[PDB]
């Protein structure tokens, strides 16, 4: 319910274009890249014996 | 008294229309979110028992 005024109507749909279609594509390749090293760099830790 | 100094007179009536609007336009989407999240998360908390 911000689609009545043009100023806060344009503002609300600029969110979704960034979020659903451009920010969401980055959070996938930032998660899989994070989960890449975080499983890699715990190998380099000494055995806990 | 900046009427004639080009740079200082430029930013004088920038903030009149650009900041009574956008900060207010920022004020809607933050107040829509925060009242939702905080009241969700204080309801997540435990009562005094």
From Swiss-Prot, chains A, B:
Resulting phenotype, residue 25 to Q: In BCYM3; results in a gain of function and a constitutive activation of the channel
UniProt-annotated location(s): Cell membrane; Apical cell membrane; Cell junction, Adherens junction; Cell projection, Cilium
Highest taxon of source: Eukaryota
Ranges that cross the membrane: 18-45
Phenotype for residue 3 to H: In SMDK and PSTD
Stretches assigned to the Cytoplasmic side: 3-17
Tissue: Found in the synoviocytes from patients with (RA) and without (CTR) rheumatoid arthritis (at protein level).
Effect of residue 11 to C: Found in a patient with spondyloepiphyseal dysplasia Maroteaux type
Post-translational modification: N-glycosylated.
Disease: Brachyolmia 3: A form of brachyolmia, a clinically and genetically heterogeneous skeletal dysplasia primarily affecting the spine and characterized by a short trunk, short stature, and platyspondyly. BCYM3 is an autosomal dominant form with severe scoliosis with or without kyphosis, and flattened irregular cervical vertebrae.
Function text: Non-selective calcium permeant cation channel involved in osmotic sensitivity and mechanosensitivity. Activation by exposure to hypotonicity within the physiological range exhibits an outward rectification. Also activated by heat, low pH, citrate and phorbol esters. Increase of intracellular Ca(2+) potentiates currents. Channel activity seems to be regulated by a calmodulin-dependent mechanism with a negative feedback mechanism. Promotes cell-cell junction formation in skin keratinocytes and plays an important role in the formation and/or maintenance of functional intercellular barriers.
Annotated domain remarks: The ANK repeat region mediates interaction with Ca(2+)-calmodulin and ATP binding. The ANK repeat region mediates interaction with phosphatidylinositol-4,5-bisphosphate and related phosphatidylinositides.
Subunit field text: Homotetramer. Self-associates in an isoform-specific manner. Isoform 1 and isoform 5 can oligomerize, but isoform 2, isoform 4 and isoform 6 cannot oligomerize. Interacts with calmodulin. Interacts with Map7 and Src family Tyr protein kinases LYN, SRC, FYN, HCK, LCK and YES. Interacts with CTNNB1. The TRPV4 and CTNNB1 complex can interact with CDH1. Interacts with PACSIN1, PACSIN2 and PACSIN3 (via SH3 domain). Part of a complex containing MLC1, AQP4, HEPACAM and ATP1B1. Interacts with ITPR3.
Family membership: Belongs to the transient receptor (TC 1.A.4) family. TrpV subfamily. TRPV4 sub-subfamily.
Name under which the protein is recorded: Transient receptor potential cation channel subfamily V member 4
Species lineage: Eukaryota, Metazoa, Chordata, Craniata, Vertebrata
Residues of the whole record sequence present: 592 to 640 of 871
């Amino acid at each position: 319910f911000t689609r009545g005024l043009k100023l806060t109507g344009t503002y609300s749909i600029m969110i979704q274009k960034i979020l659903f279609k451009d920010l969401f594509r980055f959070l996938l390749v930032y998660l899989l890249f994070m989960i890449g090293y975080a499983s890699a760099l715990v190998s380099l830790l000494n055995p806990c014996a």
